[PDB]
Amino acid sequence: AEGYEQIEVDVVAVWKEGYVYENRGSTSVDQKITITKGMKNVNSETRTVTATHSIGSTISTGDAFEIGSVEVSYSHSHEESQVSMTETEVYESKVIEHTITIPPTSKFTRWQLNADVGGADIEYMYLIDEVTPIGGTQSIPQVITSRAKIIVGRQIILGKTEIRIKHAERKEYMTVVSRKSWPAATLGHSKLFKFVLYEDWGGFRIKTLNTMYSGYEYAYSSDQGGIYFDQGTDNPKQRWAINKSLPLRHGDVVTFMNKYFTRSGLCYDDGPATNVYCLDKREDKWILEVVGLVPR
Ligand SMILES: C[N+](C)(C)CCOP(=O)(O)O
Ligand SMILES: C[N+](C)(C)CCOP(=O)(O)O
Ligand SMILES: C[N+](C)(C)CCOP(=O)(O)O
Ligand SMILES: C[N+](C)(C)CCOP(=O)(O)O
Ligand code: NA
Ligand code: NA
Ligand code: NA
């Protein structure tokens, strides 16, 4: 995908009890059994998963990623074997069902292999099964190498990477126009409006590469709430807070809270001229898009 990348990473997997039936008497008893091989509470509208917990140095809680493939290696019965998963397999619920004939004086142990890719609980990645005598020894499976390959947005380097900021609900880009002889933010369909994100002691700064008044390039909130662009200063009014852990990445959905008006977030609002405002106790979702390449 245009702006994403694959990365290998270690994930946690374990063999659970699953189901256990004991037939201590005679004769052979039949039992129906149903299991659902699939990711727990999987969203049908998307494959992007918001991390509930970390996956090493690469993923942190709240980070967006997509599971490309998962490869867990196990040892049973005294022999090694490995099972791989496709993207379609990790995101599908297969309700496997059938009858198991338990022979007399024997236990049926259906083991349940799972995987927790940073919060994403893959219930029943695999089913081994094991019929064994009572009270005889049985082989317990053990995961030897659990690992996954995730898909993430290309990183945004602060003060370096040129991005486009797009309003998620309205699918329109933040653009710059003149208002009161100052540069001003307003929503538009143009892909020509590039920005650079910075970070210092006071917060994040949104610099425009499309100003008409030279030097007036950092986004800030007026007392009235309208978003204008000023010259670089120490003022909190031009400093912002992002609700997402670094590193920022392509396609990240974020909110921008003002550092001076601390409860006022950046959003769409029908102004008389422009429509990008800082409004109290409300904060709209914006997409960060890493720019492609211009032709020449
Ligand atoms: C994995 N399996 C249950 C389909 C075959 C292996 O049976 P067993 O290893 O418990 O004897
Ligand atoms: C007046 N307004 C609330 C619609 C936005 C204008 O902000 P401002 O340009 O007066 O600083
Ligand atoms: C937008 N509001 C009128 C609800 C309050 C926010 O004022 P402001 O923080 O944008 O200056
Ligand atoms: C006082 N100072 C000039 C060193 C910093 C002031 O930054 P500012 O918020 O007044 O623009
Ligand atoms: Na600094
Ligand atoms: Na300012
Ligand atoms: Na408007």
Author numbering: 6 to 301
What do the paper's sentences say?
Lysenin from the earthworm Eisenia fetida is a pore-forming protein that specifically interacts with sphingomyelin (SM) and may confer innate immunity against parasites by attacking their membranes (Bruhn et al., 2006; Cooper et al., 2001). The structure reveals that lysenin has two domains. The topology of the lysenin structural fold establishes it as a member of the aerolysin family of pore-forming proteins (Szczesny et al., 2011), which appears thus to be conserved from bacteria to annelids. Here we report the crystal structure of lysenin alone, and in complex with the sphingomyelin headgroup phosphocholine (POC), and with SM itself.
The crystal structure of lysenin was first determined in space group P6522, with one molecule per asymmetric unit (a.u.), by multiple isomorphous replacement with anomalous scattering (MIRAS, one SeMet and one Hg derivative) and then in space group P1 with four molecules per a.u. by molecular replacement. In the crystal form with space group P6522 the protein was found in complex with a phosphocholine molecule (lysenin:POC). This lipid headgroup binds specifically within the β-trefoil via a hydrogen bond network involving residues Tyr233, Ser227, Tyr282, and a salt bridge interaction with Lys185. Residue Gln229 is the gate regulating access to the POC binding pocket: in the apo forms of lysenin, Gln229 is in a closed conformation, blocking the entrance to the POC binding site, but has opened in the POC bound state. Lys185 aids in defining the gate, as it is in a different conformer in the apo form, preventing interaction with the phosphate moiety. Unlike other β sheeted POC-binding proteins, such as staphylococcal LukF, the POC pocket of lysenin does not involve cation-π interactions between the electron-rich systems of the tyrosine aromatic rings (Olson et al., 1999), but it is similar to that found in actinoporins (Mancheño et al., 2003). We also find an additional POC-binding site, which indicates how lysenin might be guided in its attack on the target membrane. We suggest that lysenin interacts with the membrane initially by binding of POC in lipids such as SM through its β-trefoil, after attraction to the membrane surface through charge-charge affinity; it will then bind the full length of SM. The structures described in this study suggest that lysenin interacts with POC—not necessarily only that of SM but also from phosphocholine lipids—via its lectin domain prior to pre-pore assembly and pore formation.
